[PDB]
Amino acid sequence: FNLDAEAPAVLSGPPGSFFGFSVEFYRPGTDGVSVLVGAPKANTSQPGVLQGGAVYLCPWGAQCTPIEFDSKGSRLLESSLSSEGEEPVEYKSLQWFGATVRAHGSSILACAPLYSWRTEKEPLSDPVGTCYLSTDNFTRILEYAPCRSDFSWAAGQGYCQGGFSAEFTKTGRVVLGGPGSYFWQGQILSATQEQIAESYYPEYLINLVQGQLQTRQASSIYDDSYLGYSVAVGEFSGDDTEDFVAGVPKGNLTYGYVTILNGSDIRSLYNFSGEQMASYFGYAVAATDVNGDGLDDLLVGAPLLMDRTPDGRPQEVGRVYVYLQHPAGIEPTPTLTLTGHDEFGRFGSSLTPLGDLDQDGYNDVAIGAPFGGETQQGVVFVFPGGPGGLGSKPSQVLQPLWAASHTPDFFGSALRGGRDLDGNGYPDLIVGSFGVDKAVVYRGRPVV
Amino acid sequence: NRCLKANAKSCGECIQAGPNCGWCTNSTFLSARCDDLEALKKKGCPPDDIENPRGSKDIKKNKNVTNKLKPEDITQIQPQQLVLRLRSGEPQTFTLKFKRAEDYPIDLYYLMDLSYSMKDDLENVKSLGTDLMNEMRRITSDFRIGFGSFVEKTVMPYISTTPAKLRNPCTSEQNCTTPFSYKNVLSLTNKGEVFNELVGKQRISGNLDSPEGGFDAIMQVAVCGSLIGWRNVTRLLVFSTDAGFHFAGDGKLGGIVLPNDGQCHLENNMYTMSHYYDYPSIAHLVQKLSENNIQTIFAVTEEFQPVYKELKNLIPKSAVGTLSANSSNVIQLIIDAYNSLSSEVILENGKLSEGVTISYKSYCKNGVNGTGENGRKCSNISIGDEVQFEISITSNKCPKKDSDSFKIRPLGFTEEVEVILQYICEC
Amino acid sequence: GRGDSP
Ligand SMILES: *[C@@H]1O[C@H](CO)[C@@H](O[C@@H]2O[C@H](CO)[C@@H](O[C@@H]3O[C@H](CO[C@H]4O[C@H](CO[C@H]5O[C@H](CO)[C@@H](O)[C@H](O)[C@@H]5O)[C@@H](O)[C@H](O[C@H]5O[C@H](CO)[C@@H](O)[C@H](O)[C@@H]5O)[C@@H]4O)[C@@H](O)[C@H](O[C@H]4O[C@H](CO)[C@@H](O)[C@H](O)[C@@H]4O)[C@@H]3O)[C@H](O)[C@H]2NC(C)=O)[C@H](O)[C@H]1NC(C)=O
Ligand SMILES: *[C@@H]1O[C@H](CO)[C@@H](O[C@@H]2O[C@H](CO)[C@@H](O[C@@H]3O[C@H](CO[C@H]4O[C@H](CO)[C@@H](O)[C@H](O)[C@@H]4O)[C@@H](O)[C@H](O)[C@@H]3O)[C@H](O)[C@H]2NC(C)=O)[C@H](O)[C@H]1NC(C)=O
Ligand SMILES: *[C@@H]1O[C@H](CO)[C@@H](O[C@@H]2O[C@H](CO)[C@@H](O)[C@H](O)[C@H]2NC(C)=O)[C@H](O)[C@H]1NC(C)=O
Ligand SMILES: *[C@@H]1O[C@H](CO)[C@@H](O[C@@H]2O[C@H](CO)[C@@H](O)[C@H](O)[C@H]2NC(C)=O)[C@H](O)[C@H]1NC(C)=O
Ligand SMILES: *[C@@H]1O[C@H](CO)[C@@H](O[C@@H]2O[C@H](CO)[C@@H](O)[C@H](O)[C@H]2NC(C)=O)[C@H](O)[C@H]1NC(C)=O
Ligand SMILES: *[C@@H]1O[C@H](CO)[C@@H](O[C@@H]2O[C@H](CO)[C@@H](O)[C@H](O)[C@H]2NC(C)=O)[C@H](O)[C@H]1NC(C)=O
Ligand SMILES: *[C@@H]1O[C@H](CO)[C@@H](O)[C@H](O)[C@H]1NC(C)=O
Ligand SMILES: *[C@@H]1O[C@H](CO)[C@@H](O)[C@H](O)[C@H]1NC(C)=O
Ligand SMILES: *[C@@H]1O[C@H](CO)[C@@H](O)[C@H](O)[C@H]1NC(C)=O
Ligand SMILES: *[C@@H]1O[C@H](CO)[C@@H](O)[C@H](O)[C@H]1NC(C)=O
Ligand SMILES: [Ca+2]
Ligand SMILES: [Ca+2]
Ligand SMILES: [Ca+2]
Ligand SMILES: [Ca+2]
Ligand SMILES: [Ca+2]
Ligand SMILES: [Ca+2]
Ligand SMILES: [Mg+2]
């Protein structure tokens, strides 16, 4: 309730670039505090690349300029230079670079989940996906494509789309979700920044990272599960190594489920199942302590959840589930459920920790409903944490102050909070609105 | 009681606070004038003095149920219009009579998966047009049939996008045609021979991921109206496949984020916006299938029965059948589904104003009486059978001072009952 | 029988 909603800061990008599809805080120290915005449809100065996508750096102080991860066009096949006509070995056009943007310390991870390549054998069109990792404040740039392996095509990791979802741990470990691996069984892959740089050799296209953790191929009964559709991190195993939370929205007869994996050996620890078929339970996941007991609690979104009005009419509203952790573990059934009230509102499409917004000792949460509102522009709900868990009523409701237009705004489809952008002691919030190519920054004012 | 505890300062306030309250006008009564209808006479209040406005029920349109007639000339529900004046907290109940028509036309649209796993199936359907039309001849005197095909969204990663695989998504020997979202091969017609002719020309296709994009097609069939040629009769949509289904959210893998708009986008009988709009959600299909009165028959293989069994529970007016190896049993499947769908009625009402509530009580054959959510439906309704519903409406506020109106209708029919509401707020 | 295949 202490976010400055009457006058937020609006960042604007190029038209049609989907500027705001992904948002993130960047701070190599404190002096260079900045906002990162992904624009997956942005045109770039890369030669021969159409709408390669871009990431914009927006320093906070007094605007936005694109970061140059890769200035090169699509590389050429080795043996094509023998034949009559050079041909690309990869396809960076329409790769959606910047679909996911995450940062940890002076490192920035930007992913292109629709990046595809030919392979150097039989011609394919494998969307293996790729990520670029900047380190030490843009002094070294690395490419990281863990799914670009010996095992090609849908049967292997050819359609992995690695980087479709991503996140950093507290130690800076990279965690990637690739929902397309092994006939869309899905896959989690992870490697330390040291491990990635140690085996980085751009002359060879295939990934050779040693010590890399990754989930294993299962039987065909698990196909089309989209494991790794969304990802988050949090401690759930009782040690000091953050664990991996992964959404599996089409698992178990498309009732969907969320899984927690051991950050040490990626082995499965817990499962949480949805309550309705094709509700997309696991569309979005988050981990944060919402009741100040020191144990990270789980939040899951199911934006297609369909309930009935009192007069008997069905309606798509969406629903969020909260699982409170306790010293013995976690219960499979939710402690609390939050239900949207806007038809086709898609409540629970995005979730982000807010830290402690009002400094009352309990961390708070923001939940997006990209198509909520009286004009379907989108809405963001702030829910207060407390000793009994998250509150069932919002403490604040954020909406765009600009008028609706010919196209949806998608306001609230991308969220990021839990960090202090201006150093006033109160955490702040970034809201994406890529439909109109805008990102909004809400600041926490000291209030009562 | 709550009549005295209301402290009614006028005749008006007394009415909206409790249905059991009356107002004394005598001036010989020793806010105490607002008491129970019994508590006033016990205190010496003349009945000619106790003002007590009461709700009422007035039928306005009441064509009797029917027993050579056009579909619009057939009455299956009565009354068709009535007025209910509502006292706050006092329910008004009225009877709804439903009768299943003797002979009613049928539109059946056959929407078929033409992905590669449906290769052997397409060969058996070569005579489905004339064979089905023969069977329906002993069910209805007016039958029409249509045919549509679907595969998948025409974008990465759902299809392979190499130039060769775009021309032929299958192997070299296999002469598969290019992948396509949805094709309206044949609009509804009474010529079964044309169905055989055009279905016999269609070519099997293919794609990459096992779940297919039939939901995009179902949506189009549901909302495209005249392009399909739906009549205001029994509308059957047979959905034949051997795979699971994509739904909203799956589109995001291909960068498709716009929700389905539920609008018609056929150009040259081809769906042209599969690359632009995401797959519909089940809830979105529920809305549009119901709105356009489409009754869905899911003719799916044995292994996907569990999935489509759950889908049927979510979709009103839908049925599931086990499709044989290559659609050899599809006709009997359709007949069994129709008999099941037509023998059950389900009532739905429009949105009510806040403070207003509705309740159903069904009275079916063999003395089977339903209440709660079961009060909305009757089953085992044979041809010519009559069932009745007792429908109560109660207002607990004073919504507006203007009259409200909403419709009650059985799913799958244009016929409806217009219920006009009027609220007693003053004496 | 994985993907779109019999
Ligand atoms: C949350 O929910 C999820 C999903 O709902 C659930 O995950 C599933 O859990 C079940 C049960 O654990 C899994 O099913 C089992 O899978 C076992 C893994 O098989 C691996 O290892 C096999 C043996 O060798 C390998 O690995 C070691 C190193 O670890 C190595 O040294 C060896 O050399 C060797 O490589 C291996 O054979 C197997 O690979 C085979 O199968 C795959 C997939 O088909 C195939 O690609 C390979 O070619 C090969 O044929 C794999 O690498 C498995 O051992 C286990 O076996 C039992 O069942 C079979 C059949 O029923 C019995 O015959 C056998 O005797 C055992 O009783 C079983 O199959 C399932 O795969 C998981 N699914 C997913 C998606 O993860 C979580 O557990 C849930 N979590 C919680 C907390 O509840
Ligand atoms: C990124 O740069 C792109 C250019 O490389 C931008 O795309 C261009 O957008 C403009 C405006 O919408 C288009 O101009 C119109 O073109 C139509 C017909 O064009 C058709 O032919 C081209 C030939 O290649 C084809 O590519 C198109 O898809 C069309 O089928 C004219 O009738 C109009 O009058 C108008 O001139 C360009 O055609 C289009 N170019 C390409 C290569 O697509 C894109 O908008 C930029 N996006 C961002 C976010 O910066
Ligand atoms: C997460 O995985 C780690 C590593 O396997 C587990 O810790 C190991 O426990 C085994 C028990 O046999 C020991 O042999 C290893 O030495 C341990 N390794 C490490 C790095 O701790 C840990 O128990 C797992 N966590 C949970 C909650 O199961
Ligand atoms: C897979 O989903 C089913 C239901 O879709 C889960 O079972 C249901 O389990 C809950 C308890 O977890 C019960 O309340 C329901 O009544 C169950 N339904 C039926 C029909 O039995 C099942 O646990 C899920 N399994 C996994 C591994 O996710
Ligand atoms: C089938 O019935 C529907 C509903 O009665 C008809 O749609 C209505 O058509 C009238 C034409 O005067 C319009 O004024 C209404 O607004 C329409 N209402 C709805 C809900 O569509 C439709 O025209 C009929 N079609 C056929 C072929 O009989
Ligand atoms: C269901 O409701 C019907 C009302 O139509 C009940 O049948 C009535 O039963 C009473 C005696 O119990 C008779 O006096 C009436 O004449 C009957 N109605 C008719 C239309 O014949 C029936 O008993 C109810 N059954 C259940 C199980 O509730
Ligand atoms: C990082 O480099 C940028 C220029 O790319 C510069 O503006 C900034 O001050 C540097 N910050 C640190 C902490 O080195
Ligand atoms: C259809 O299925 C039958 C088995 O019932 C099989 O013998 C026949 O070869 C199949 N035909 C095609 C064209 O797949
Ligand atoms: C594929 O079939 C068409 C007609 O269906 C035919 O004209 C064409 O020659 C065939 N192609 C091959 C390679 O057999
Ligand atoms: C339907 O009703 C008839 C006659 O009323 C009865 O013989 C039959 O058993 C009923 N069927 C079911 C499934 O209730
Ligand atoms: Ca841990
Ligand atoms: Ca906690
Ligand atoms: Ca707080
Ligand atoms: Ca701040
Ligand atoms: Ca088949
Ligand atoms: Ca498919
Ligand atoms: Mg298929």
**At residue B341, what are phi and psi to the nearest 5 degrees?**
-70, -40
Distance CA A112, CA A126 (A): 13
Q: Is the dihedral of CA A407, A412, A416, A422 positive or negative?
A: positive
Q: How far is CA A17 from CA A38, A44, A406, A438, in A?
A: 9, 10, 17, 10
Collapsing DSSP to helix, strand or coil, B46 comes out as coil
CB B301 within 8 A of CB B330: no
Centre a 10 Å sphere on the Cβ of residue A190 and count the other Cβ atoms it contains: 24
A362 annotated as belonging to a binding site for a ligand? yes
Cβ contacts of B416 within 8 Å, gap of 6 or more: B77, B80, B407, B408, B409
Buried b (16+ CB within 10 A) or exposed e, B404-414: bebebbbbbbe
Question: Do A311 and B351 lie within an 8 Å CB cutoff?
Answer: yes
Query: Which chain B residues are within 8 Å of C1, Cβ to Cβ?
Result: 117
Query: Which chain C residues are within 8 Å of B211, Cβ to Cβ?
Result: none
Q: How far is CA A363 from CA A333, A334, A336, B54, B155, in A?
A: 22, 19, 16, 55, 42
Question: Do C4 and B117 lie within an 8 Å CB cutoff?
Answer: yes
Distance CA A189, CA A174 (A): 8
What DSSP letter does each residue of B346-407 carry, written as one string?
A: EEEE-PPPTTEEEEEEEE-GGG-EEEGGGGGEE----TT-EEEEEEEEEESS---SSPEEEE
B209 annotated as belonging to a binding site for a ligand? yes
Angle between helices B305-314 and B282-291 in degrees, nearest 10: 60
By the 10 Å C-beta count (0-12 exposed, 13-18 middle, 19+ buried), A396 is classed as: middle
**At residue A83, what are phi and psi to the nearest 5 degrees?**
-90, -175
Question: Do C2 and B210 lie within an 8 Å CB cutoff?
Answer: yes
- Could you check whether the bond before residue B157 is cis, i.e. omega within 30 degrees of 0? yes
CB A148 within 8 A of CB A178: no
Strand A140-144 and strand A130-135: the pairing is antiparallel
Write down how long chain A is: 448
**Token pair of B225, please?**
């109206």
Distance CA A36, CA A22 (A): 8
Distance CA B93, CA B234 (A): 30
Query: Which chain A residues are within 8 Å of C1, Cβ to Cβ?
Result: 220
What DSSP letter does each residue of B107-169 carry, written as one string?
A: EEEEEEE-SGGGHHHHHHGGGHHHHHHHHGGGT-S-EEEEEEEE---SSTTTS--SHHHHH-S
Distance CA B375, CA B347 (A): 9
CB B185 within 8 A of CB B240: no
Cα–Cα nearest to B167, from B158, B154, B157, B177 = B177
Q: How far is CA B179 from CA A33, A161, B167, B228, B424, in A?
A: 49, 22, 8, 22, 62
**Token pair of B5, please?**
């505890």
Ligand 3 centroid, distance to A89 Cα (angstroms) = 42
CA angle, B138 as apex, B137 and B143 as ends, to 5°? Answer: 35
Cβ contacts of B257 within 8 Å, gap of 6 or more: A410, A413, B251, B278
Shortest-distance atom of ligand 4 to CA A255: 5
**Subunits with 3+ C-beta pairs closer than 8 A to B:** A, C
Distance CA A239, CA A263 (A): 10
Kindly provide the resolution of this structure in angstroms, with one decimal.
Answer: 2.5
Angle between helices B192-199 and B128-135 in degrees, nearest 10: 150
Ligand 7 centroid, distance to B420 Cα (angstroms) = 70
Q: What is the CA radius of gyration of chain A?
A: 21
CB A25 within 8 A of CB A419: yes
**Token pair of A339, please?**
């239900």
**Token pair of B217, please?**
């097609």
Q: How far is CA B161 from CA A155, B178, B279, in A?
A: 16, 11, 20
CA atoms within 13 A on the CB side of A121: 7
Shortest-distance atom of ligand 6 to CA B369: 1
Q: What is the CA radius of gyration of chain C?
A: 4
**Token pair of A30, please?**
């404190």
Interface test with A, best of B250, B289, B318, B358 (most A CBs within 10 A): B250
Q: How far is CA A200 from CA A114, A128, A144, A208, A209, in A?
A: 22, 18, 8, 8, 8
Cα–Cα nearest to A54, from A11, A101, A90, A103 = A101
Domain chopping of chain A, boundaries = 1-448
Side chain identity at residue B350, one-letter code: G
Q: Is the dihedral of CA B226, B229, B234, B239 positive or negative?
A: negative
Distance CA B122, CA B147 (A): 12
Cβ contacts of A53 within 8 Å, gap of 6 or more: A38, A39, A40, A41, A42, A44, A95, A96, A97, A98, A99, A112
Cβ contacts of A96 within 8 Å, gap of 6 or more: A40, A41, A53, A112, A113, A114, A115, B255
CB B207 within 8 A of CB B152: yes
C-alpha A201: how far from its chain's center? 27
Q: What letter would DSSP give residue B424?
A: E
Q: How far is CA B200 from CA B183, B190, B204, in A?
A: 15, 17, 11
Beta pairing partners, A414: A432
For a mutational test of ligand 3's pocket, the pick from A235, A262, A266, A295, i.e. the residue with the most ligand atoms closer than 8 A to its C-beta, is: A262
Distance CA A224, CA A182 (A): 9
CB A92 within 8 A of CB A115: yes
Angle between helices B282-291 and B214-223 in degrees, nearest 10: 20
**Strand locations in B33-126 (E):** 34-36, 56-61, 77-78, 81-87, 92-99, 106-113
CB A91 within 8 A of CB A133: no
Buried b (16+ CB within 10 A) or exposed e, B50-78: bebbebeeeeeeeeebeeeeebeebbbbb
Strand A306-308 and strand A314-316: the pairing is antiparallel
Distance CA A20, CA A38 (A): 6
Centre a 10 Å sphere on the Cβ of residue A209 and count the other Cβ atoms it contains: 20
Side chain identity at residue A53, one-letter code: G
- Could you check whether the bond before residue B399 is cis, i.e. omega within 30 degrees of 0? no
Strands of the sheet containing B270-271, edge to edge, are B266-267, B270-271, B182-189, B143-150, B106-113, B234-241, B294-300, B318-322
Closest CA to ligand 7's atom 1: A137
Q: Is A96 in the pocket of ligand 4 (CB under 6 A)?
A: no
Side chain identity at residue B175, one-letter code: N
CB A52 within 8 A of CB A131: no
Cβ contacts of B28 within 8 Å, gap of 6 or more: B44
Strand B143-150 and strand B106-113: the pairing is parallel
Query: Rounded to the nearest 10 degrees, how much is the dihedral formed by the CA atoms of B377, B382, B385, B388?
Result: -10
Domains of chain B: 1-51 (3.30.1680.10), 52-102+343-427 (2.60.40.1510), 103-342 (3.40.50.410)
Centre a 10 Å sphere on the Cβ of residue B424 and count the other Cβ atoms it contains: 19
First and final C-alpha spacing in chain B: 22
Q: Is A396 in the pocket of ligand 3 (CB under 6 A)?
A: no
Cα–Cα nearest to A445, from A433, A430, A427 = A427
Beta pairing partners, B321: B299
CA atoms within 13 A on the CB side of B213: 34
Cα–Cα nearest to A346, from A394, A277, A397, A279 = A279
Q: Which class is domain A1-448?
A: mainly beta
Strand A140-144 and strand B386-395: the pairing is unpaired
Question: Do C3 and A220 lie within an 8 Å CB cutoff?
Answer: no
Q: How far is CA A9 from CA A412, A429, A432, B383, in A?
A: 15, 11, 12, 66
Distance CA B252, CA A367 (A): 19
B325 annotated as belonging to a binding site for a ligand? yes
Query: Which chain C residues are within 8 Å of A220, Cβ to Cβ?
Result: 1-2
Q: Is B414 in the pocket of ligand 5 (CB under 6 A)?
A: yes
Closest alpha carbon within chain C to B213 = C4
Distance CA A50, CA A44 (A): 8
Ligand 11 centroid, distance to A420 Cα (angstroms) = 26
**Subunits with 3+ C-beta pairs closer than 8 A to A:** B, C
Beta pairing partners, B355: none
CB B107 within 8 A of CB B236: yes
Shortest-distance atom of ligand 10 to CA B366: 5
Distance CA B198, CA B185 (A): 7
Q: Is A43 in the pocket of ligand 2 (CB under 6 A)?
A: yes
Collapsing DSSP to helix, strand or coil, B240 comes out as strand
Closest CA to ligand 2's atom 50: A43
Query: Which chain B residues are within 8 Å of C3, Cβ to Cβ?
Result: 208-210
Q: How far is C1 from chain B (nearest CA, A)?
A: 9
Cα–Cα nearest to A40, from A31, A49, A48 = A49
Query: Which chain C residues are within 8 Å of B302, Cβ to Cβ?
Result: none
Pocket of ligand 6 (CB under 6 A): B 363, 367, 369
Distance CA B256, CA B251 (A): 5
Distance CA B414, CA B75 (A): 11
- Could you tell me if A222 lies within 8 Å of chain C, comparing CB atoms? no
First and final C-alpha spacing in chain C: 6
Write out chain A in H/E/C secondary structure.
CCECCCCCEEEECCCCCCCCCEEEEECCCCCCCEEEEEECCCCCCCCCCCCCCEEEEEECCCCCEECCCCCCCCCECHHHCCCCCCCECEECCCCCCCCEEEEECCEEEEEECCCEECCCCCCCCECCCEEEEEECCCCEEEEECCCCCCCCCCCCCCCCCCCCEEEECCCCCEEEEECCHHHHCEEEEEECHHHHHHCCCCCCCCCCCCCCEECCCCCHHHCCCCECCCEEEECCCCCCCCEEEEEECCCCCCCCEEEEECCCCCCEEEEEECCCCCCCCCCEEEEECCCCCCCCEEEEEECCCEEECCCCCEEECCEEEEECEECCEECCCCCEEEECCCCCCCCCCEEEEEECCCCCCCCEEEEEECCCCCCCCCEEEEECCCCCCCCCCCCEEECCCCCCCCCCCCCCCEEEEEECCCCCCCCEEEEEEHHHCEEEEECECCCC
Find tokens 């470990």 and name the residue.
A173
Cβ contacts of A87 within 8 Å, gap of 6 or more: A76, A77, A80, A118
Beta pairing partners, A259: A246, A271
C-alpha A204: how far from its chain's center? 29
C-alpha B253: how far from its chain's center? 31
Distance CA B244, CA B304 (A): 7
CB B249 within 8 A of CB B179: no
Query: Which chain B residues are within 8 Å of A155, Cβ to Cβ?
Result: none
Cα–Cα nearest to B400, from B418, B423, B419 = B423
Of the candidates B119, B120, B209, which has its C-beta nearest C3's C-beta?
Answer: B209
**At residue B426, what are phi and psi to the nearest 5 degrees?**
-135, 165
Q: Is the dihedral of CA B137, B140, B142, B144 positive or negative?
A: negative
Distance CA B133, CA B199 (A): 15
Q: What letter would DSSP give residue B173?
A: S
Which residues of chain B approach chain A closer than 8 Å at the C-beta? 156-157, 160-162, 164-165, 208-211, 244, 247-250, 253-255, 257-259, 281-284, 286-287, 306-307, 310-311, 314, 348-349, 351-352, 357-358, 373, 376
A136 annotated as belonging to a binding site for a ligand? no
Beta pairing partners, B121: none
**Token pair of A121, please?**
């054998």
Side chain identity at residue A431, one-letter code: V
Side chain identity at residue A115, one-letter code: Y
Ligand 9 centroid, distance to B413 Cα (angstroms) = 46
Write down how long chain B is: 427
Distance CA B168, CA B218 (A): 25
Q: How far is CA A60 from CA A99, A309, B250, in A?
A: 22, 45, 36
Q: How far is CA B106 from CA B142, B187, B283, B317, B351, in A?
A: 7, 14, 26, 15, 29
Distance CA A347, CA A343 (A): 9
Q: Is A405 in the pocket of ligand 1 (CB under 6 A)?
A: no
A213 annotated as belonging to a binding site for a ligand? no
User: Phi-psi bin for B27: left (phi > 0), alpha (psi -120 to 50), beta?
Assistant: left
Cα–Cα nearest to A380, from A442, A424, A308 = A442
Centre a 10 Å sphere on the Cβ of residue B362 and count the other Cβ atoms it contains: 24
Q: Is the dihedral of CA A84, A85, A86, A90 positive or negative?
A: negative
Distance CA A80, CA A89 (A): 9
Q: What letter would DSSP give residue B250?
A: G
Closest CA to ligand 10's atom 2: B380
Side chain identity at residue B142, one-letter code: D
Question: Do C4 and B115 lie within an 8 Å CB cutoff?
Answer: yes
Q: What is the CA radius of gyration of chain B?
A: 28
Distance CA A129, CA A143 (A): 11
A235 annotated as belonging to a binding site for a ligand? yes
**Token pair of B389, please?**
């519903």
Q: What letter would DSSP give residue B197?
A: H
By the 10 Å C-beta count (0-12 exposed, 13-18 middle, 19+ buried), A29 is classed as: exposed
A321 annotated as belonging to a binding site for a ligand? no
Question: Do C3 and A154 lie within an 8 Å CB cutoff?
Answer: yes
Ligand 14 centroid, distance to A444 Cα (angstroms) = 5
Shortest-distance atom of ligand 7 to CA A28: 13
**Token pair of A305, please?**
């959840």
